[PDB]
Amino acid sequence: LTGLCDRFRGFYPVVIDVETAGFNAKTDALLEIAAITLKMDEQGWLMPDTTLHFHVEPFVGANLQPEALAFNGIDPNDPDRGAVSEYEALHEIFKVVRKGIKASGCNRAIMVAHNANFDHSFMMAAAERASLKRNPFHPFATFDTAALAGLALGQTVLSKACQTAGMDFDSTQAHSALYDTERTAVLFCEIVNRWKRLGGWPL
Amino acid sequence: LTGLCDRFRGFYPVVIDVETLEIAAITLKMDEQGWLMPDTTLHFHVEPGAVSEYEALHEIFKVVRKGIKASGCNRAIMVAHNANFDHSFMMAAAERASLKRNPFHPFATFDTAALAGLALGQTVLSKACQTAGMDFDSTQAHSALYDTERTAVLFCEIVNRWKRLGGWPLSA
């Protein structure tokens, strides 16, 4: 049962990490986003495909409150960032994903992240603000690698899951978005593949 | 390695469903040889013979608290289908009903929609159950007790298949 569109009922997994000004998806600002789409070789093995990355600028009515910013120590309005607009990044991400979905034979995108549902809610609220009416991501489903890894390897913590999975993980580079996203994707793939390897797939 | 506190880094999984107000919880246990199965079922009808929101939670917690201590685990984790929905409600309720010793982890959850995704390539609970060859009657899916029980069996079945194919232990 080769082919990605048969592995998750038409869902096109896309690994996503976000970095934010604060905990609140509706009020607090989006600062950075990384996305990696996945592809499946003629043998049914899963692997990264495209990688995108952006630094985002705070949206208009954003929460730019001293106490809130200070909390996680970042300056969003710092002009030395190479940041693009919320719309620009999401537009570009969605665009790749859409191309991916079409070409893969899938019907919808599903986000893959560690503790996924929180990042998910951030990237939805943002696309709404952006007015991206053709958001290809499922509005509530997510593959959360924390649970997957708990099943797959008995580990729930991203670092520890990676280490156990046999891959290496650099705790220094840690909570930088791209690195995370990238590790996660590999971790997510290993888990899916390892499941095939042990004859879980197909049925 | 044979025992809940070994399987999930010490988390004690508790399958939970909420429906609208009604709530059901099933705890799990492992046999001598390390197969997962339902331990205790709890089911309540709650007013937002219906019990209070405090009672329901207090009683569930009481059971979970006991099971953890008995199985050498360290915290409860909530197993649910699209778990974050139910998990949110729960924690709100716990707070709102001023509950002293909540055993549940504050944001971690085992979501069966994803586990099913991996293990059976289906996301919807009904589909996941049938693919796993379990019985599933959707007319009935509006019942929190029916849903939970199916979810628990499904979850045990995923976890157990993984063992069966040899993905666990990792290597005792």
Residue type, B100: K
Query: Total structural domains in chain A?
Result: 1
Tell me whether residue A19 is annotated as binding. yes
The partner residues of A111 in beta bridges, in order of sequence, read A14, A142
Quickly list H helices, chain B.
4-7, 53-71, 83-96, 112-120, 125-131, 144-165
- Method used to solve the structure: X-ray
The CATH number given to whatever domain includes residue A119 is 3.30.420.10
For residue B17, say whether it is annotated as part of any ligand binding site. yes
Tokens found for residue A26? 């509706």
Containing structural domain, residue B29: 1-172
8 A C-beta contact, residue A112 and residue A185: yes
Q: How many CB atoms lie within 10 A of CB A131?
A: 8
Shortest distance, CA A143 to any CA of chain B (angstroms): 5
Q: B95 phi and psi, to 5 degrees? A: -65, -60
Closest CA in chain A for residue B110 = A147
For the record, the structure tokens of B58 come out as 């207090």
Query: Can you give the resolution of this entry in Å?
Result: 3.1
Q: Do B108 and A156 touch (CB under 8 A)?
A: yes
> Dihedral, CA atoms, B132, B133, B135, B140, nearest 10 degrees?
40
Secondary structure class of B44 (helix, strand, coil): strand
Question: What is the layout of strands, in order, in the sheet containing A46-55?
Answer: A46-55, A30-40, A11-20, A108-113, A137-144
d(CA B86, CA B23): 10
Report the residue from A7, A146, A201 with minimal CB separation from B108.
A146
Q: How far apart are CA A45 and CA A141, in angstroms?
A: 23
Q: Does residue B147 have a known ligand-binding role?
A: yes
- Dist. CA A104–CA A98, nearest whole Å: 10
Verify whether the Cβ–Cβ distance A198 to B167 is below 8 Å. yes
How many Cβ contacts (< 8 angstroms) between chains A and B? 85
A163 touches chain B (CB under 8 A): no
